[PDB]
């Protein structure tokens, strides 16, 4: 037996046994278990067994689920022997100054108010300024430019937090920490070699790598920084940034899209001049604020100049906030560098596969060597589907971003709000759909409707959903983005009475989530694999969206609605999404 195997639920013991075995054998184990099965105890036992063997063990997991992970591990007597610590590196926090400035710059009152409130945690010392919270507040946050770096002045609150939090057999870190560690490891805090790696919520890991390997040149705060400097080299740098912005206008007009360097050679002169000038103004007498701003800007411009990254131009015709994104479409090299510094690994997530035991997509995303992948059978008990009603109602008009489609879909959603026992989460695939559905549902569902938009984040909507449900209303949340994948809609006021959990009683998927992924990795994956990758990403996102209904066993009165007309229209390409839905009693 394994340390803490008695704490693990019986339904996970075969998964745990195979995972421990194959991980000790040097395999990258794929372990998918339904949310609410006690996966934290399984991970605790895996890490305890590995560290008991003398292995360096690292558990990479988001800080949202890290409190309970430490709680599950601190109960194992052998874990209390070999040591447990948290490597709360700088890739975990944001820069309060830069993040504030960004929030006012882009009119995000939620993010601005959270930064002004002290960055206190939405979910030793109290952890604040977390990157994951800011991402829940700005799904499109440019983490790269706002992450707390070692070049930040020590009077920064997040910098002081990192230094204080820098307070050993089992090391626990976040996905972003592990990605940044991989990056710094490959160049010419954490173990240089990972004997045993365990990744909770592995489906997020790839998104953490792409974020770490993305560079972001934001022109407005950079120019505003240089304006408040000495006149030594100010005029050339400002002229060069102006030339870069003009060239960005020209290059975005050149073709109307994630395009490479060779498609926009006009920026090449521009960025080289920019870097040159950003290195020519004297460091003598710059506060480390401006030092960070300018060095981050030079790094971003050089990564753009690399020719190995792909660029996004966001300029005046389309985006009031000028910005140059340069990300990698090929984290192949990065994640192989990771796995080569790893003896064995267990990837744990509620959603690892797409339409089956099929872990092809996820193995491609994390670039696991095919000779090390070990696909275990997924564990989904009966209670994930037993208290669920899959209703037969749906919108006849196909989802086409039209006024007519909104007019019909909103009637169906109105009926759902009419028969709902508690809250209702209506998942959407774009802000345009949210705005149309809000236009039709506003007057009737008043003081019940929550409209998630570019000005109302997923987490402010989450807090409001919880609040209006606590007040006895049956709130109806038109949500998107993290609402598909991130939110945990289980009533924390009823930890021991799941039969009374009515926080989310009716989930309504408006559209098949085709096209929710816009990352460079997925774009290249499509350019290689085709509609296979498109459909598999859709099915994966769809299973994630379904995973918001039943978060623990013993719940009752959960209703599921799928309004997409193509689901019931007899088209062949919608074949996977029906299979998943056939796991219910309609």
Numbering used by the authors: 107 to 229, 240 to 283, 288 to 308, 325 to 392, 396 to 725
The article reads:
CasDinG is an ATP-dependent 5′-3′ DNA helicase essential for bacterial Type IV-A1 CRISPR associated immunity. To provide immunity against plasmids, it is proposed that type IV-A systems bind DNA with an RNA-guided multi-protein Csf complex, and then recruit an accessory helicase called CasDinG to the DNA. It is supposed that, once loaded onto Csf-complex-bound DNA, CasDinG uses its ATP-dependent 5′-3′ helicase activity to silence transcription of nearby genes, mediating immunity. CasDinG contains an essential N-terminal domain predicted to bind DNA.
In an attempt to determine the structure of the N-terminal domain we solved the structure of a new crystal form of Pa CasDinG where overhang dsDNA substrates were included in our crystal conditions. To test our hypothesis, we screened crystals of Pa CasDinG grown in the presence of a 5’-overhang duplex DNA substrate. Orthorhombic crystals grew from precipitate after two weeks. We found that Pa CasDinG in the crystals had been proteolyzed corresponding to a ~12 kDa shift in molecular weight. The diffraction pattern corresponded to a unit cell of 67.04 Å x 84.01 Å x 97.619 Å and a P 21 21 21 space group, distinct from the unit cells of previously solved crystal structures. Matthews probability coefficient suggested a single solution of 1 CasDinG subunit in the unit cell with a solvent content of 29.75%. This was in the bottom quartile of solvent content for this resolution range, suggesting that CasDinG was tightly packed in this crystal morphology. The structure of Pa CasDinG revealed two helicase domains (HD1 and HD2) and two accessory domains (FeS-like and Arch domains), that aligned well (RMSD = 0.547 Å) with other models of Apo Pa CasDinG. Consistent with our Urea-PAGE analysis, no density for nucleic acid was observed. Additionally, no density was observed for the N-terminal domain of Pa CasDinG, despite the tight crystal packing, which we had hoped would constrain the previously observed flexibility of the domain.
